[PDB]
Amino acid sequence: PITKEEKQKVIQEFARFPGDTGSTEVQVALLTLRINRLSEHLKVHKKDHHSHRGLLMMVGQRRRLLRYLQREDPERYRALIEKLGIRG
Amino acid sequence: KRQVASGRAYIHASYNNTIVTITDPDGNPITWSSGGVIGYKGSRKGTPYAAQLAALDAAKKAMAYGMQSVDVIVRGTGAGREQAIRALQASGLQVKSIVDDTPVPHNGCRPKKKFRK
Amino acid sequence: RKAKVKATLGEFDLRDYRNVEVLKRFLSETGKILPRRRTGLSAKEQRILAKTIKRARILGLLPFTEKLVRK
Amino acid sequence: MRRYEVNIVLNPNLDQSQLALEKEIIQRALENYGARVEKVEELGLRRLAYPIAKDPQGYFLWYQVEMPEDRVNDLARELRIRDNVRRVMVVKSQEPFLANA
RNA sequence: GUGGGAGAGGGUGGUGGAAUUCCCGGAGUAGCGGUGAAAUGCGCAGAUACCGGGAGGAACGCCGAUGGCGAAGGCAGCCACCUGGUCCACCCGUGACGCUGAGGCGCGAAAGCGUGGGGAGCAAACCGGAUUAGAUACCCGGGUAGUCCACGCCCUAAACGAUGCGCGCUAGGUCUCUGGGUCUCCUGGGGGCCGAAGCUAACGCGUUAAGCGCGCCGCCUGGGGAGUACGGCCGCAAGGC
Ligand SMILES: [Mg+2]
Ligand SMILES: [Mg+2]
Ligand SMILES: [Mg+2]
Ligand SMILES: [Mg+2]
Ligand SMILES: [Mg+2]
Ligand SMILES: [Mg+2]
Ligand SMILES: [Mg+2]
Ligand SMILES: [Mg+2]
Ligand SMILES: [Mg+2]
Ligand SMILES: [Mg+2]
Ligand SMILES: [Mg+2]
Ligand SMILES: [Mg+2]
Ligand SMILES: [Mg+2]
Ligand SMILES: [Mg+2]
Ligand SMILES: [Mg+2]
Ligand SMILES: [Mg+2]
Ligand SMILES: [Mg+2]
Ligand SMILES: [Mg+2]
Ligand SMILES: [Mg+2]
Ligand SMILES: [Mg+2]
Ligand SMILES: [Mg+2]
Ligand SMILES: [Mg+2]
Ligand SMILES: [Mg+2]
Ligand SMILES: [Mg+2]
Ligand SMILES: [Mg+2]
Ligand SMILES: [Mg+2]
Ligand SMILES: [Mg+2]
Ligand SMILES: [Mg+2]
Ligand SMILES: [Mg+2]
Ligand SMILES: [Mg+2]
Ligand SMILES: [Mg+2]
Ligand SMILES: [Mg+2]
Ligand SMILES: [Mg+2]
Ligand SMILES: [Mg+2]
Ligand SMILES: [Mg+2]
Ligand SMILES: [Mg+2]
Ligand SMILES: [Mg+2]
Ligand SMILES: [Mg+2]
Ligand SMILES: [Mg+2]
Ligand SMILES: [Mg+2]
Ligand SMILES: [Mg+2]
Ligand SMILES: [Mg+2]
Ligand SMILES: [Mg+2]
Ligand SMILES: [Mg+2]
Ligand SMILES: [Mg+2]
Ligand SMILES: [Mg+2]
Ligand SMILES: [Mg+2]
Ligand SMILES: [Mg+2]
Ligand SMILES: [Mg+2]
Ligand SMILES: [Mg+2]
Ligand SMILES: [Mg+2]
Ligand SMILES: [Mg+2]
Ligand SMILES: [Mg+2]
Ligand SMILES: [Mg+2]
Ligand SMILES: [Mg+2]
Ligand SMILES: [Mg+2]
Ligand SMILES: [Mg+2]
Ligand SMILES: [Mg+2]
Ligand SMILES: [Mg+2]
16 A cells, blocks of 8 residues: 555655645655556556556656646756656 | 155256156155156147146156155246146145245356347 | 335344344345345445345355245 | 454364364464454354355354455465365454444 | 545456356156257167266356446456545645647457467357258257467457537536535535526437537548548558558
């Protein structure tokens, strides 16, 4: 799955402040978390296609969120990417 | 030639014919009869009358074989099933319990085109 | 048009695949699981009762099918 | 971990040594698969519905456990290897859902 | 974000009964099967009907619904794991991050192809039996591919709601699935049915629009010729665009 613990820990990480949950950064982290989880899922199970749909979508979201952050503040974008380490 | 005297009567009733098999409390048959065990040859074995005469054959036979009480069981839906049980009602045999056993499957096997949809 | 199943029974876990005469009270004189028309449950109720019965059958607690008496 | 229930229907004809020995194998499987046992209700042998293994009745155990998710299956795999075990049923345990309270 | 929820949504491994078929055994005897009626078939090497045992495959009766889930194709025994979507309540966080989407990429019923398994029931082709004016057919008895599995291709369809996606706007009534409420009732989110205004050639549609609007993609331009020819592109092929 993903435990309560794990999700917490990743936010209590990427949050812009105390109480941050919905920040662009954070969502991007979640989506990556979730992604990697699902990609490893389809490392086996190369036949579960209906989940693949989801992967494709979660990827799309991640990408838009990234692009926005870049458009807005290139600094925190580079920083975020150079944390999660993807496509940058 | 064992003198059974208590047993099962099996009515198997198809759109095409009827068979009574008389067996013992353990299920081994004692005697039997059918559409064309009596005269009838073609379709005519389906008629309920065919069933009466057949049922009574199976009785009378079993009765000289020594039997009085029987337990009826019925497989299949078909004309003159009821007529077969009827025949047994007063066959001279005490009809202890009628019962309906017709196998239904849980959808295993793919029917002959005749029986589909 | 007799009277409806759930009306008889008191409170019962509808999840109990261990619990029988409560369960058997949901089946035909053949093994057959009973219609809502006859049981008087709800969409969800009947729905859980199903899996419950089936779980129980597999366990050898409830009958998969039965013979039919008279006829 | 998650909390399952484990039903065991085994040979109603067991003498005592034999019974306590199947029980022993069970204990061992559970430890070896990582399940802590939070309860037991053993209703013992009961009249069946339909024959199982040519037998008219069966000996009933029930174990409420909490154990490693990913291991549950292997556990059942293992529990089943005994000829003297007839049927084995594991379940994620839910909460009572009742009606007519 | 947090907290709940329903679900044949997907993949994997397991396992449960019913029925068919075949094999073993008991008992039993002369026919069963099949049709409009029949015959072919099967049966004294003892069938059928009955009881007991066994193997193997395929599909899951009742529940089952006018029901649910899914983008579509589609999805049904039970169990466990792996996972996608989606709904609600709190109104917590980000602050226009949005809509559509030519190319591209992925999915894509059935049939079909390749390689290797598997093969019970069914069953194109085929072998027979009957009907018929004949019967390359409708009915009957056999039967191979194939239906099943793995992997890789194939990319079609009455792939239908013959209704592209998003948002906003315009009476109600009623039945229902699923949430949350102070729970005869209100409030979300689906499924149906009647009907305001409006639309419509009609039939019909009508808050699940075929009404009133805006954005954006796809498409149409009389019937044949023809989804043919040629060219290109994919394809092992069949063939597809
Ligand atoms: Mg006949
Ligand atoms: Mg056939
Ligand atoms: Mg075993
Ligand atoms: Mg949640
Ligand atoms: Mg499912
Ligand atoms: Mg599944
Ligand atoms: Mg499976
Ligand atoms: Mg069987
Ligand atoms: Mg034999
Ligand atoms: Mg004719
Ligand atoms: Mg001959
Ligand atoms: Mg012969
Ligand atoms: Mg001889
Ligand atoms: Mg048998
Ligand atoms: Mg077997
Ligand atoms: Mg075989
Ligand atoms: Mg078997
Ligand atoms: Mg939908
Ligand atoms: Mg369809
Ligand atoms: Mg889920
Ligand atoms: Mg706010
Ligand atoms: Mg602010
Ligand atoms: Mg889009
Ligand atoms: Mg496209
Ligand atoms: Mg396809
Ligand atoms: Mg296919
Ligand atoms: Mg070919
Ligand atoms: Mg044929
Ligand atoms: Mg022919
Ligand atoms: Mg012809
Ligand atoms: Mg012909
Ligand atoms: Mg004809
Ligand atoms: Mg071939
Ligand atoms: Mg093939
Ligand atoms: Mg395939
Ligand atoms: Mg079209
Ligand atoms: Mg479109
Ligand atoms: Mg489109
Ligand atoms: Mg469409
Ligand atoms: Mg338009
Ligand atoms: Mg959208
Ligand atoms: Mg609209
Ligand atoms: Mg309505
Ligand atoms: Mg409610
Ligand atoms: Mg509603
Ligand atoms: Mg209308
Ligand atoms: Mg009007
Ligand atoms: Mg409205
Ligand atoms: Mg509605
Ligand atoms: Mg129009
Ligand atoms: Mg023209
Ligand atoms: Mg033209
Ligand atoms: Mg074409
Ligand atoms: Mg060409
Ligand atoms: Mg040219
Ligand atoms: Mg290609
Ligand atoms: Mg070429
Ligand atoms: Mg063609
Ligand atoms: Mg195309």
